[PDB]
């Protein structure tokens with residue numbers, strides 16, 4: 001209630017501190033890291049890269065990250081536990097389903113999916129005893145029949161446990177509006193929901209309207225930009241060619257509209273990425289060598305330079321994630 | 330070759346005995362059994378059902394099964410090792426890819442897939458040290474671009490290791506022809522390849538032509554011809570309308586053409602099945618209560634009463650799988 005689940009166990013909200021609410025240790029597929037660790041060099045290499053990055057993030061002030069990797073994103077909670085302890089950075093794990101559910105998931109009913117999400121929240125992930133502190137879901141512009149089942153199961157699990165829901169959207173297609181409609185039809189409060197990847201669009205009418213309804217707005221891909229990489233089609237398709245300053249200005253824009261309390265900010269970074277083209281991680285690490293420290297090192301001063309008060313920035317990076325993550329019936 | 334890798338380690342060809350060459354302990358999805366074991370009741374319950382099933386097949390004469398569950402069929406080799414040890418039945422594990430690869434597989438090149446298949450054959454599966462003894466691949470229609478990559482990677486892994494390739498086809502679409510074409514373009518000998526689910530057609534000329542080219546013909550879904558389930562909206566696509574005796578006669582027909590050495594028979598059974606609609610296992614177990622014992626208890630006697638001599642049935646069930654599974658690069 002005043003405590004949230006992490007991969008090291010329960011912590012009080014006051015311990016969460018500066019929190020990044022949409023991150024990944026490794027973006028992969030179910031079973032993949034354990035079946036083919038050499039894809040990442042080795043499991044050891046991957047863990048060490050994550051520990052170095054989390055430590056640099058910690059140096060820059062980060063105390064908690066939320067790993068929104070689901071089952072079908074190849075979430076390995078044992079890896080999360082290992083790197084969280086070695087970095088001494090809190091990591092909140094996720095249940096839910098992303099965009100790559102296997103047959104054994106996509107043939108399930110809303111009731112079955114509800115039970116799977118509840119298992120991971122109430123009992124534990126796999127046989128680790130580690131409990132999810134958030135439910136991650138994903139849709140593609142026009143919500144598919146299966147994706148709708150996932151969103152309803154997520155709402156039902158959220159209503160039963162008080163843990164929040166966070167989403168993947170195509171903001172260019174105003175995806176949050178379809179998601180919100182489903183959530184509310186299940187009686188879920190918007191205060192329990194983050195509409196993510198919302199910095200992918202410059203449509204302020206879309207963002208403010210969701211914010212006005214009490215939704216959290218996930219401006220979570222700030223460092224993603226293929227500017228200077230236009231000759232790389234795969235990188236351009238993934239990162240887009242909007243600048244990080246462009247993305248960041250949306251944070252200021254929503255503050256200026258009076259919605260500072262609805263903003264969540266993150267890097268959507270990762271230290272391995274097998275569910276995309278080979279060597280994409282090298283491209284991303286040259287674009288953003290700061291990794292997950294990009295937000296405190298580059299974005300926060302940018303905003304302070306634009307005249308946003310320190311107290312407002314602290315409220316966005318500490319207070320908002322705390323209110324969001326804290327299980328609330 | 331001389332030794333075949335199993336989930337308990339290497340065995341000599343003579344130790345293999347009566348072998349079922351296309352089976353599953355559990356048809357699932359990668360990561361699924363460990364993330365949601367309660368879907369099967371529990372891991373323990375699934376394990377215990379498999380051990381009873383394998384002990385029943387063993388009492389009917391079976392000594393080895395080949396579990397052709399791939400990574401994306403949620404193969405759990407630790408489970409296979411457990412069940413194998415408790416049932417005293419050899420289990421050969423598979424590498425390769427079936428029809429549900431995740432993004433991290435679907436985005437890989439033929440060269441990368443080759444490395445993955447090779448790691449599972451040469452080094453081991455996951456961190457278990459258990460090595461695959463067969464490469465399983467699957468196609469639909471006229472073979473998709475990704476499936477062609479898988480078949481080529483499988484051929485390359487087979488050529489580097491001598492381990493055979495076994496396939497999932499749509500026999501009604503003569504799917505084996507396109508698979509064979511791809512394998513032969515890679516310089517793979519047809520004697521290293523089993524074209525599976527071949528009993529799901531009545532087109533004997535299609536099967537005979539493949540056997541003539543030296544392919545192994547996998548007659549492996551004999552008990553799936555259901556009969557009685559046209560009211561069910563899922564038991565005609567996974568099961569059948571024909572009778573099992575009709576399928577079984579395909580075996581005799583190939584024997585009579587002189588291709589007994591090209592025949593492999595199996596049940597394609599399983600003890601859990603999460604990659605389908607809920608409760609399908611109850612439907613399947615009710616239609617075929619023999620499970621993996623269907624072949625030795627029903628099909629072998631049926632063939633014997635159709636005039637097939639003991640030496641021929643033993644060649645098919647013992648000799649052919651031994652020759653197939655023994656790692657070889659000598660055509």
Ligand SMILES: C[As](C)(=O)[O-]
Pocket residue numbers: 027073168268
């Ligand atoms: C794993 As992602 C690029 O949907 O945040």
Ligand SMILES: C[As](C)(=O)[O-]
Pocket residue numbers: 356402497597
């Ligand atoms: C796992 As199957 C039904 O293709 O043999």
Ligand SMILES: [Zn+2]
Pocket residue numbers: 168169197
């Ligand atoms: Zn996303």
Ligand SMILES: [Zn+2]
Pocket residue numbers: 022023024068268
């Ligand atoms: Zn993400």
Ligand SMILES: [Zn+2]
Pocket residue numbers: 497498526
């Ligand atoms: Zn098959």
Ligand SMILES: [Zn+2]
Pocket residue numbers: 351352353397597
């Ligand atoms: Zn099969």
